[PDB]
Amino acid sequence: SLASLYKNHIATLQERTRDALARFKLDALLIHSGELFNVFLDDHPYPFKVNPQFKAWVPVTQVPNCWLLVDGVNKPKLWFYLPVDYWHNVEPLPTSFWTEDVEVIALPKADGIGSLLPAARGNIGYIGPVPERALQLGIEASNINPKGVIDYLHYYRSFKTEYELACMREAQKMAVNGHRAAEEAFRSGMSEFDINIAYLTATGHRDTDVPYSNIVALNEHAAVLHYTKLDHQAPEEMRSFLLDAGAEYNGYAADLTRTWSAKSDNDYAQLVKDVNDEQLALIATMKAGVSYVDYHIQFHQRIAKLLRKHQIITDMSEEAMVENDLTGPFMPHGIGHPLGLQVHDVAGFMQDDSGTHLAAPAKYPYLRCTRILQPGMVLTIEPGIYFIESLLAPWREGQFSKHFNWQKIEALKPFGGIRIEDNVVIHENNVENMTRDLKLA
Amino acid sequence: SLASLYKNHIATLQERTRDALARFKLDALLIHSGELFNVFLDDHPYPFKVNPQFKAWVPVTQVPNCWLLVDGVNKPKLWFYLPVDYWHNVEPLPTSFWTEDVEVIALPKADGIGSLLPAARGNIGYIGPVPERALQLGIEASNINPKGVIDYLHYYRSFKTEYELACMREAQKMAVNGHRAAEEAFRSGMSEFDINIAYLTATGHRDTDVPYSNIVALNEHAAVLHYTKLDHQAPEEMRSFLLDAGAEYNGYAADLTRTWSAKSDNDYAQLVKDVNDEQLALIATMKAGVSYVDYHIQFHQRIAKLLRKHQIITDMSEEAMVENDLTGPFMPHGIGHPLGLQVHDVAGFMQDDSGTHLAAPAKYPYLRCTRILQPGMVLTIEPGIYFIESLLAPWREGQFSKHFNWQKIEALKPFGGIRIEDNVVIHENNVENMTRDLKLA
Ligand SMILES: [Mg+2]
Ligand SMILES: [Mg+2]
Ligand SMILES: [Mg+2]
Ligand SMILES: [Mg+2]
């Protein structure tokens, strides 16, 4: 099943590659997995992060010095770095399903790749993180990471193959398990550090191989959007927990966010439940052929609803709240973004395979996606509401200050904020919510 | 007390810097903490690894875009990157023990540094991982990471101040706690992954912030010198555990290795005990004024003694065993190296402040230290005995094959290997074993 899906994946990628080579007048693409490099003045290596364009073809993510030659017609060729040394642990020559559709060739020495490459290299496009290596290998200067080919392929990354979707559902499983374990850790009164430990234990991940840094935010930290630190002692009293964490399977990411209240009978808990319901309703409105921006704006309308309902903003209609941008400081980020091999996946602004860029509207400058919904797309939906003094301050001084319930805002600050993130897949007649299909409350 | 020590530290570094600047004809050093950089084609950042030369002055290890300006006479100036935006964690400048000896100035934008630096930059030497940024700031290309100054400073990093020693002792405490918890995990039959969890829990480290990747090796994996993988299921039969792991405090590293046998009554357990005792005896022989190579060779003699005692190598004297290099494949690495801000600390081969280089002897090409011991040096002592087929097998094709007890070697291979590592401080008339002072058995 997964194997046959992978045969389709290879066929799709071969077609895209063939079209790209035809358009940009190239013979083939040489895709480099990457190389190790050390910290300044030290021999301490940075962790290896594989070229996304490399793992786009094959599930090999932990091996540098690998090389993929593709022409869209012949069987893809993979030179797989296989050093023989007693120092390091070395990955064996892979023989999994994918090796049936990809010709795997052992590469004992990294500098042995040059003699194995095609004789004529003048029309080969190199894609990889080491341009100097490409130049050494006889790749023409302009064929080193050519932006036209890269943009083309990125545009087509927007549309996931069935194999990719299967991989992403598998990542969803791991992330869900992690989130449940983390919630249990929170309920037990554990610190952010220990909660993180519980998440990693449940997922089988290390902090060095999660698709992105975990956000384990207790209380006020929930209002901190890029919170990546971990307190080693639990707060004096538990109030709230925002967890933005995910997982990875065959290079494909899940990226989930859940928010919990320590108590269930306060304003904050009610607000969390409301954000949940609004998120689900928004998703229920989603369909192909509609701009993603529409859904961003839509959630700002829902924010206006919640602000009015909870008496956070008073003496103003929801419509006027949106018109005057009062909802702006409460969700100062976008409703979400494409998801795939990368967490913030490529082509979020790209309208065609020629690289046409459509920026976010000035009113919502941090929106990461301006794409028309089409079947095959995988997108995050991550609405939130936060109470951030630096953003609220100018409002307190301005003409709309009287509309803000500063007392209640102060009362909500110690709870930080709320975000609820699912990952969905656009289909012809519906939207598949992978996260909720796994019943993550 | 740490404040007073730090004041002394500042005085020391000031004088070193003054002398270096006078010698290599510069007015000041501009030392850059570093910059974030992302994965190829992604917005996923690599973990931040501070410039060792930067944390050499101040205990700031997690903040990019910081700049130290030092002339060796006036109070050190530190522009501390302190951005004001509703993302990540917002807080004021540090007011810790070190902020009275250094002038700390908030830097809200990374590109604002250039207008805050002295106008005359023709004689300012840049030290940092971003030469391009130095060029942008008008630093002469020949003054970007100047070899003379860097080598000089590296040479003097060999001699730790009292502040540095204190920090290293704290790191020792952390690491010792980790090793104890890890041994306990091992005895309980836990997988490498769970043992690593236990280590991280006891030290309070993350995999992303350990000074070097943990080596958690069960059974045969102990024969793999750089084993940084983790099995998630415990092996069928527990036989051995080699743990090479450490900790960091104020940017200063501890690096410890311990080896345990599942059973206490077999040959392997006895060999582990013997290696431990021989390590301790070697350390008991250590003296200032003596070459480190002497101690490397000495431990090869001790290895010869053990191999003879255990009937692993037969019918050859210890002296002849060393002369013919039969002990070679049993410890294919150095006896140790300088330790400090970096794990493999600097100036290991550097004989003077002019950068004179003394290579390891050809017989022991992987020895990382050729220094004469002097008071204030911190060194690792990490002897080991391993059973590595790729290194042992060729001896069967040679004239000394008859001296190898291949049967016993075959019996010992399932246990992998043994390494016992302590971190020691050289003093005038004694050697301080920080690790054993903490009673890590
Ligand atoms: Mg997220
Ligand atoms: Mg997201
Ligand atoms: Mg060491
Ligand atoms: Mg070590």
Residue numbers in the entry:
A (entry chain A), B (entry chain B): 3 to 443
Share the article's original sentences.
To better understand the potential significance of sequence conservation between the E. coli and human prolidases, we solved the structure of the bacterial enzyme at 2.0 Å resolution. The asymmetric unit contains a single PepQ dimer, which is the native oligomeric structure of this protein, arranged head-to-tail with inter-dimer contacts made between both domains. The active site of E. coli PepQ also features canonical metal binding residues, Asp246, Asp257, His339, Glu384 and Glu423, chelating two metal ions. Because PepQ was crystallized in buffer containing magnesium, the density found in this region is most likely derived from magnesium ions. Additionally, the mF0-DFc difference map shows greater density for one of the two metal ions (chelated by His339), consistent with reports from other pita-bread fold peptidases that this binding site has a higher affinity for metal ions. The decreased occupancy at the second metal site is surprising, given that the magnesium concentration during crystallization was in the millimolar range. This observation suggests that the affinity for magnesium of either PepQ in general, or this site in particular, is not as high as seen for the preferred manganese ion in related proteins, reported to be in the low- or sub-micromolar range,,. PepQ R370 is, however, in an appropriate position for the guanidinium group of the arginine to interact with the C-terminus of the proline residue.
Prolidases, also known as Xaa-Pro dipeptidases, are metalloproteases that catalyze the hydrolysis of dipeptides containing a C-terminal proline residue. Prolidases share a number of conserved sequence and structural features. The catalytic site features a binuclear metal cluster in the center of a pita-bread fold that is a canonical feature of this family of enzymes. Here we report the structure of E. coli PepQ, showing it to have the predicted pita-bread fold.
